[PDB]
Design a protein around this ligand. Structure first.
Ligand SMILES: O=C(Nc1ccc2c(c1)CNC2)c1cccc2[nH]cnc12
Lengths: 39, 156
């Protein structure tokens, strides 16, 4: 049995850690809601 | 129970100790999370109970207490913030420029940040603090890393 606990406010924070790249990927979405790589 | 707006952890005591299986957004009295986090099961909020209202396995989304309320969209140009809520760790904002998932039915924004599976449901925000989608449904690239879509529901 599942339960919820508050973790914080939803706010934009100035000067946050800027990381991660921006890749363009060819994907397919199936009926089970799972993505896969199309190549 | 607690229905204040904000980000929340989704916990379970069924396994060893207390385990974080996901995260969610409380907005306008509705709890929003990813389908694979809860499988549509009822949730507990203190003494209160949250019952599922809408859900879809293909979109991988589910809402509790009412219809899906989140309807902001990524503008296709600006940086966003993943408000990551990792298991056992403090909520933390991570700024990134999203990539693109190209599909046969159009393009979707995608954030390339690798977090544990228990981080699923963590909101992705625009500069106004509005939730433009949830993190936790994507793909595993050649590197072994995870790249999640910016998954957004429909506000009826
Ligand atoms: O596996 C993940 N997500 C997921 C699981 C089950 C299902 C779906 C998505 C959609 N259909 C059912 C995941 C989420 C977040 C970070 C991750 N790192 C490695 N895998 C993940």
């Amino acid at each position: 049995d599942m339960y919820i606990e508050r973790a914080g406010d939803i706010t934009w924070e100035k000067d946050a850690e800027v990381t991660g790249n921006s890749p363009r990927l060819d994907v397919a979405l199936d009926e089970s809601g799972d993505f896969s790589l199309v190549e | 129970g607690e229905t204040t707006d904000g980000v929340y952890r989704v916990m379970t005591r069924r396994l060893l100790g207390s385990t974080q299986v996901g995260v969610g957004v409380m907005q306008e009295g509705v709890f929003h999370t990813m389908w694979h986090v809860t499988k549509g099961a009822a949730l507990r909020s203190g003494e209160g109970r949250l019952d599922p209202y809408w859900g879809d396995v293909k979109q991988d989304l589910v809402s509790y207490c009412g219809p899906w309320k989140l309807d902001a969209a990524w503008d296709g140009l600006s940086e966003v913030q993943l408000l990551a809520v990792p298991p056992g760790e403090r909520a933390k904002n991570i700024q990134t420029l999203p990539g693109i998932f190209k599909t046969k039915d159009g393009d979707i924004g995608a954030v390339a940040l690798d977090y544990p599976a228990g981080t699923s449901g963590s909101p992705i925000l625009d500069k106004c603090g509005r939730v433009i989608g949830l993190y936790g449904n994507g793909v595993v690239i050649k590197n072994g890393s995870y790249v999640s879509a910016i998954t957004q529901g429909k506000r009826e």
